[PDB]
Amino acid sequence: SGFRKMAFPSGKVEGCMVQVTCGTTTLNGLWLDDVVYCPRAVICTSEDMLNPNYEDLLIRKSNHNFLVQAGNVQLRVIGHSMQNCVLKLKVDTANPKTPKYKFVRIQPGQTFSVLACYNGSPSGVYQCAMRPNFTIKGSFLNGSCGSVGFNIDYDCVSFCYMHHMELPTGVHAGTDLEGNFYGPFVDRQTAQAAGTDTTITVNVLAWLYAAVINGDRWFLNRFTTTLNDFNLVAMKYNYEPLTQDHVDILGPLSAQTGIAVLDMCASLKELLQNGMNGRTILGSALLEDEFTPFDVVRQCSGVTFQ
Amino acid sequence: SGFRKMAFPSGKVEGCMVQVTCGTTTLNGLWLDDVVYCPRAVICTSEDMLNPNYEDLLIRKSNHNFLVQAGNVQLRVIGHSMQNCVLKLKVDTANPKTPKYKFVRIQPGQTFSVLACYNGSPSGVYQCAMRPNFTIKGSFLNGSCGSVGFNIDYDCVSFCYMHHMELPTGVHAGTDLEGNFYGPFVDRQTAQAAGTDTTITVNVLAWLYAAVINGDRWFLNRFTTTLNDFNLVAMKYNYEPLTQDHVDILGPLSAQTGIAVLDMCASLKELLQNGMNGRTILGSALLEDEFTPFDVVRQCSGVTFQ
Amino acid sequence: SGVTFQSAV
Amino acid sequence: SGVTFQSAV
């Protein structure tokens, strides 16, 4: 029993973190096989960031302008190239700790673990979601640039996020591991702001199912709703529309608990319309949207507390 | 910026997890040097648990009754002994991945990371606190027995918790790494229940300081309080008394933010008396008590967003 | 209730 | 504001 915001064990990623330095700028990189991946902003002074032309800035650099430190060992850079907003530094040594891995670009609403790192040294691990507005609500300080987000499935690390910057509202923006930003953001010092965000409806429904599996039913009701009528209410409360695909994805949780998806939707509609009136769900006084249906299945028992 | 429930990177502990089997019972153990540590309940059938005499049960076992599996390798047990509620199995091979480590027995209100594990395989990492009633609000399923909690300080792992059981309210009880339960609990199938719990006042104050460091001040006020008067209100709301030592511990956060501890106490008194009236702090609609003053300092910038 | 030991079979 | 790149010096 119990339900916690749970990250994946971070050891497979810890063994990949290194420090990259170019000139006076230092940040983290990810060392897989004989390549180190890091934000291309490592080549910029803070003055370069106002209107960088990265192709122009990088042609001015040579391999020896890049210092890569892995623990107590300097790795010699023997090639470099830029892919979107990431730099790829070929080094003379393959990381003996390279896990089985993939790079994946995730959809909004998916969750992942972040290994926050400073100067190549992992600091902490936490779980977060890609928001609908393509920011993450992370926890990052100066020096965190280059930290990665990931999911793990049967000892294969799927990397999905590399950290680049913090927006004025304190939320975070970054790229996939091929250097493509999530959202409209760019690696330039210019006005950029997070768009209005929305709540991830299918994840709130999954978490209501987690609450039932763990033995709680107080918020349920005898009603149902049509998908169309639910979405009319969702739109009013700044929730994303629920699609039939989301309904299908919630099938396994629905089957485990005996609560039809549209019936859980009627429960959520009532919660949005009336509030919680002093009650909590899974220890929270707000509706939580950072657990996917897969997260719930992975963490909860396969036997419901009836 | 940002503030998340953050665990320590779990890799140093992942390399220590093994599976221990005695008869039909399997659980997790912790392999450090040439010793494996696990709950002594591994030697019990479910019938033995009604009124076990563990000294009697263990004298009936030999070294070869214990099967220890580390990944793809069987470790041969060459000695065994019982220390309180933990069993120590001496094996023929020292774990080459043993980190620098200590065993520590923590005080209530301290936090730690839990590496949830099944059949010797780590599943997830999350952060929790030792509650005042000496339970933890974890997330554990069958097979999780033997999973450990820990803190890390400069590459030294301080292990503080080994998981043993789940109480009827769904909260969790276990031991230090020397096998002494936290709280009044025993490793026997008998009526046991968590005592009434309380809120960890010094941790709520630390988290209010985290909120200020991150740029938020809405809940502050122009008032102060005496320590005695604060504790009169704390007692009314089921908060632990704040001691002068707790006040001293909050010194560094007070100095960073310019908010006297007793002034933050006046803020908390007002929050307890009036509620939040629809507002949130650090994304929560409840007052959070699972961050210690040290957790806040470790995660927050050393420069306040003024 | 009683308690639940969380070994595996 | 602008944005904050989070490298180190």
Q: Could you write out the DSSP letters of every residue in A124-161? A: EEEEEE--TTS-B-----TT-TT-EEEEEETTEEEEEE
Residue whose entry in the numeric block shows the structure tokens 């039809």? A260
d(CA A109, CA A129): 6
Under an 8 A CB cutoff, do B24 and C9 touch?
A: yes
Interface chains of chain D (3 or more CB pairs under 8 Å): A
d(CA B4, CA B54): 42
Under an 8 A CB cutoff, do C6 and B166 touch?
A: yes
- Asked if B300 and B257 touch (Cβ cutoff 8 Å), the reply is no
Chain C residues with CB-CB distance to B42 below 8 A: 7
What tokens does A83 get?
């892919």
How many C-beta atoms lie closer than 10 Å to residue B245's C-beta? 9
Sheet architecture: strand order including B25-32: B73-75, B66-70, B17-22, B25-32, B35-39, B86-91, B77-83
3-class state of residue A201 by DSSP: helix
Task: For D2, name the nearest residue in chain A, comparing CA atoms only.
Answer: A191
Interface contact B24, partner C, CB < 8 A: yes
Interface chains of chain C (3 or more CB pairs under 8 Å): B
Element spanning A299, H or E: helix A293-299
- The burial class, CB within 10 Å (0-12 / 13-18 / 19+), for A59 is exposed
Cα A70 from chain centroid (whole Å) = 25
Under an 8 A CB cutoff, do A2 and B139 touch?
A: yes
Question: What is the DSSP-derived secondary structure letter of residue B114?
Answer: E
User: CATH number, domain at B23?
Assistant: 2.40.10.10
d(CA A134, CA A136): 7
Chain D residues with CB-CB distance to A166 below 8 A: 3-4, 6
Task: For B29, name the nearest residue in chain C, comparing CA atoms only.
Answer: C7
d(CA B134, CA B132): 5
* Residue B295: closest CA among B20, B61, B5: B5
Domain assignment of residue B48, given as a range: 11-91
Question: What is the DSSP-derived secondary structure letter of residue A226?
Answer: -
* Residue A7: closest CA among A153, A152, A139, A127: A127
What single letter denotes the amino acid at residue B51? N
Under an 8 A CB cutoff, do C5 and B24 touch?
A: no
Residue A80: what are its φ and ψ, rounded to 5°? -145, 155
User: 3-class secondary structure for B210-248?
Assistant: HHHHCCCCCCCCCCCCCHHHHHHHHHHCCECCCCHHHHH
d(CA C7, CA B26): 6
Sequence-distant (6+) residues with CB within 8 A of D3 are A165, A166, A167, A168, A173, A185, A189, A190, A192
Question: What is the DSSP-derived secondary structure letter of residue B105?
Answer: P
Residues of B with CB under 8 A from a CB of A: 1-12, 14-15, 115-116, 122-126, 128, 137-142, 166, 170-172, 214-215, 280, 283-286, 298-299, 301
Q: Could you write out the DSSP letters of every residue in A76-114? A: PEEEEEEETTEEEEEESS--TTPPEEEE-PPPTT-EEEE
What single letter denotes the amino acid at residue B83? Q
Sequence-distant (6+) residues with CB within 8 A of B1 are A139, A140, A166, A170, B214, B215, B301, B305
Sequence-distant (6+) residues with CB within 8 A of A62 are none
Residue A205: what are its φ and ψ, rounded to 5°? -60, -45
d(CA A36, CA A72): 16
What tokens does B205 get?
């104050």
Sequence-distant (6+) residues with CB within 8 A of B203 are B109, B129, B288, B289, B290, B291, B292, B293
Strands (E), chain B: 17-22, 25-32, 35-39, 66-70, 73-75, 77-83, 86-91, 100-103, 111-118, 121-129, 148-153, 156-166, 172-175
- Asked if A133 and A181 touch (Cβ cutoff 8 Å), the reply is no
Chain A residues with CB-CB distance to D1 below 8 A: 168
d(CA A16, CA B95): 22
- Asked if B11 and A10 touch (Cβ cutoff 8 Å), the reply is yes
Chain A residues with CB-CB distance to D8 below 8 A: 25-27, 118-119, 142-143, 145
Sequence-distant (6+) residues with CB within 8 A of A130 are A106, A107, A108, A109, A110, A111, A112, A136, A161, A182
Task: For A97, name the nearest residue in chain B, comparing CA atoms only.
Answer: B11
Sequence-distant (6+) residues with CB within 8 A of A248 are none
Task: For B6, name the nearest residue in chain A, comparing CA atoms only.
Answer: A126
Task: For D7, name the nearest residue in chain A, comparing CA atoms only.
Answer: A143
- Give resolution, Å, one decimal: 1.5
Sequence-distant (6+) residues with CB within 8 A of A52 are A44, A187, A188
* Residue B200: closest CA among B122, B284, B287: B287
3-class state of residue A232 by DSSP: helix
Task: For A167, name the nearest residue in chain B, comparing CA atoms only.
Answer: B1
Q: For chain D, what's the residue count?
A: 9
- Asked if A49 and A43 touch (Cβ cutoff 8 Å), the reply is no
d(CA A213, CA A302): 8
Under an 8 A CB cutoff, do A4 and B128 touch?
A: yes
B4 to chain A nearest CA, in Å? Answer: 6
Q: List % helix, strand, coil for chain A (3-state, nearest 5).
A: 25, 30, 45
Q: Angle formed by the axes of helices B261-274 and B201-213, to 10°?
A: 100
Chain D residues with CB-CB distance to A191 below 8 A: 2
What tokens does B33 get?
């040097």
Partner-chain residue, chosen from A42, A173, A185, that has the shortest CB–CB distance to D7: A42
Strand-pair category, B17-22 with B25-32: antiparallel
Interface contact A203, partner D, CB < 8 A: no
Strand-pair category, A25-32 with A35-39: antiparallel
Under an 8 A CB cutoff, do C5 and B145 touch?
A: yes
What single letter denotes the amino acid at residue B30? L
Interface contact B118, partner C, CB < 8 A: yes
* HSE value, Cβ hemisphere, 13 Å, CA-based, for A163: 34
What single letter denotes the amino acid at residue B235? M
What single letter denotes the amino acid at residue A184? P
* Residue B2: closest CA among C3, A260, A173: A173
d(CA B125, CA B105): 20
C7 to chain B nearest CA, in Å? Answer: 4
Element spanning A36, H or E: strand A35-39
- Asked if A137 and B283 touch (Cβ cutoff 8 Å), the reply is yes
**Planar angle of CA A148, B138, B6, nearest 5 degrees:** 30
Task: For B188, name the nearest residue in chain C, comparing CA atoms only.
Answer: C3
Residue whose entry in the numeric block shows the structure tokens 């010092």? A189
The dihedral formed by the CA atoms of B128, B291, A13 and B157, expressed in degrees to the nearest 10:
-70
d(CA A239, CA A289): 10
Q: Angle formed by the axes of helices A227-236 and A261-274, to 10°?
A: 30
- The burial class, CB within 10 Å (0-12 / 13-18 / 19+), for A12 is buried
Interface chains of chain B (3 or more CB pairs under 8 Å): A, C
User: CATH number, domain at B229?
Assistant: 1.10.1840.10
Q: How far is CA C4 from CA A115, A281, B41, in A?
A: 33, 23, 12
Test the A interface: residue of D1, D4, D7 with most A CBs within 10 Å: D7
Cα A235 from chain centroid (whole Å) = 25
What tokens does B39 get?
């709950």
Chain B residues with CB-CB distance to A123 below 8 A: 9
Four-residue CA torsion sign, B115, B119, B121, B123 = negative
> Roughly how many angstroms between the first and final C-alpha of chain A, as a whole number?
13
Residues 1-9 in C contacting B (C-alpha not used; CB under 8 Å): 1-9
d(CA B37, CA B31): 7
Task: For A190, name the nearest residue in chain D, comparing CA atoms only.
Answer: D2
What tokens does A126 get?
């936490």
d(CA B210, CA B300): 7
Q: Do D and A touch, counting CB pairs below 8 Å (3 needed)?
A: yes
Cα A293 from chain centroid (whole Å) = 15
Under an 8 A CB cutoff, do A168 and D9 touch?
A: no
Residue whose entry in the numeric block shows the structure tokens 């063994």? A15
- Asked if C5 and B165 touch (Cβ cutoff 8 Å), the reply is yes
Query: How many beta-carbon pairs under 8 angstroms link A with D?
Result: 58
Under an 8 A CB cutoff, do A189 and D7 touch?
A: no
3-class state of residue A11 by DSSP: helix
A302 to chain D nearest CA, in Å? Answer: 42
* HSE value, Cβ hemisphere, 13 Å, CA-based, for A145: 25
Beta bridge partners of A126: A114
